[model samples]
Structures are given as C-alpha cells and as structure tokens.
Target: ADLEDNWETLNDNLKVIEKADNAAQVKDALTKMRAAALDAQKATPPKLEDKSPDSPEMKDFRHGFDILVGQIDDALKLANEGKVKEAQAAAEQLKTTRNAYIQKYL
Candidate 1:
C-alpha cells in the first residue's frame, strides 16, 4: 500500500471495528488494520518526505505504528477468546493513537 492509503485504510478499519459484532468479525477488522499499520511503518509521511528512515521523524512514525500493533495484538488475544467488548475497547485505544500521531505526521 502507498503511504497515504495505508493510514486511510487503517483508520477505516478502526471505524469498522466498532460495528464488529462477533469475535471473528473483530479479528478480521483488527487484522486488516494491523496489516495496513505494519506496511505504513515502512513509509515516510509526505509531510516528512525529505527525512531519512533513521531520522527522529521516522522514529516517531514507526513508534506510533509499533504502539498500534501492540494494542492490536493485545486486543486480538481477547478476541481469540471471544471477548468482543474488551476487543472493541482496544479499538478505541487505536483511534486515540491515530489521532495523537496524525497531528504531526498526517
């Protein structure tokens, strides 16, 4: 995925998360979000297109993705056991993460 598309798609999945009614649906939603996020970490946001991957700018970018991935992983564990409520709560955390990082990077 392209840099912009990944974030958009990730955020879309985050929104999709709220409507996920069962464990399987939640897993699919979160898994899609995680995939977009992981790919996004490899990208440099257009606002920081001039920066190198090893720069502090990129570090923060990857850090945010890492944080999201961790959150998704934790939520997936709950979802694996059919804990939809908890998993949905974790999706809210992901939106929080997205908002915080997009302020600078998006």
Candidate 2:
C-alpha cells in the first residue's frame, strides 16, 4: 500500500483503540506510523496543475484536513499516557473537523 493507505489503516485502528481505551499501545503504534506517513508524503512527487486554492471549497478542505491531522496527533499524545477520555474527545473533534470539511467542500 501507499503511504496514505498505510497511514489511514493505522489511523483507523488508532481510533478503535482510542474508543476501547487502549490508547497507550495506540500511541506507540501511531508514533511510528505517523512519522512514516509524514516522511513518505513529503517524499512523494507532487501532482500537476492543481495550481490554486481556487475556491472556498478548496480552502475549507485544506483547512479541515490540517485540523483533522493535527487532532489525530494530539489524540495520540494524550492516549500515550492512557488518557482515554481525552483521546476520545480529541478523536471526536477530529471527526467533527473531518465532517465539516466534507460537508463544506466535498
């Protein structure tokens, strides 16, 4: 699988672990996984001709995507210390950010 797919798989499971209150392990797993994702994402070649953040939709998408990613990172941090409630809250926030982007832009 590509970086996105691998990262997303890890991410999906991380959410499950978070929900199950097993975030300590999830944090360790996600730490490596997120780094891999970031490194691969940066190393990948860029797409052509998507030259502009042309509209509000694109802008919202970008903004929401950013938040979603960060929220996951934060959740990972909290979860590493066994902070299940905090992790769950962060996950929910990520979901909200994700949904907002979908509704606004997609």
Candidate 3:
C-alpha cells in the first residue's frame, strides 16, 4: 500500500512534467516527487524483502533509489535558478535510471 502511493505519486508528477508548459510548472512537478523518492528508499524489492537491510542487495536497492533522488535533486537545482533547458536536460537521465534500476528492483 505504501509503495502503491509512492509509485503513483512519482508517475503522476511525471505526467505533469510531460504536459508542463512553464518552467515553474515543471519545477513544481519535480519538487513534489521528492518525498516518494525518499520514502521508497527504505523499502525493498518484492524479491528482496527477506534480505537484511544491510545486505548487499538491500544496499543496492537503496543506492538505486538514491540515484533517482540525486538526479531529481540535480534537476531541481537547475530549475530553481530558472535554468529550464538545463534542468530538463539534467532530467534526461531519469528515464535511463528508471529503466535500468526498475529492471531488478521492481
């Protein structure tokens, strides 16, 4: 249920970004995604639920989420300064990160 909310939030905001026409609109969309990104970090993949939190698998799970968080942070920093193009460019890595990590973690 927790992930159900977190995952839905991330994708919903992604929809906002896709349709956003203004920089602030995109910024706002990216801004709202932070909580879900961080909260999801503390959870485990369905296959790794039995693993210790400190296990290598769990560590990578956290790392994978952290990378997405990091990319969002980077894009937000750019967007905060009104660097819209650069911010969107920075966000370009998010899809790559999502596909790669979701492959194993989801």
TM-score of each: 0.90, 0.55, 0.86
Off-target runs (Cα >4 Å) in candidate 1 are: none
- Span of 10 residues, lowest total lDDT, candidate 3: 97-106
Computed on alpha carbons, the lDDT of every model, listed in order, comes to 0.83, 0.56, 0.79
Task: Give the higher-TM-score candidate: 1 or 2.
Answer: 1
> Best-fitting candidate, measured by TM-score?
1
lDDT of 3 by residue, 1-106 (tens): 2666788888888778777666898798888887888887876778787888798988887787899999999888988888877777777678788677754766
lDDT of 1 by residue, 8-92 (tens): 7777877777888888988998889888888988877888888887888888888988988999999999999999999999888
Pairs of residues clashing in candidate 1: none
On the 0 to 100 scale, the lDDT of residue 71 in model 1 is 94
Local error of candidate 1 at residue 102 (angstroms): 3.8
lDDT of 2 by residue, 40-90 (tens): 333222331253545554455455546656766887878877887777666
Model 1 residue 72 lDDT score = 92
Better of 1 and 2 by lDDT: 1
Cα error, residue 42 of model 2, in Å, equals: 9.9
Deviating ranges (above 4 Å) for candidate 3: none
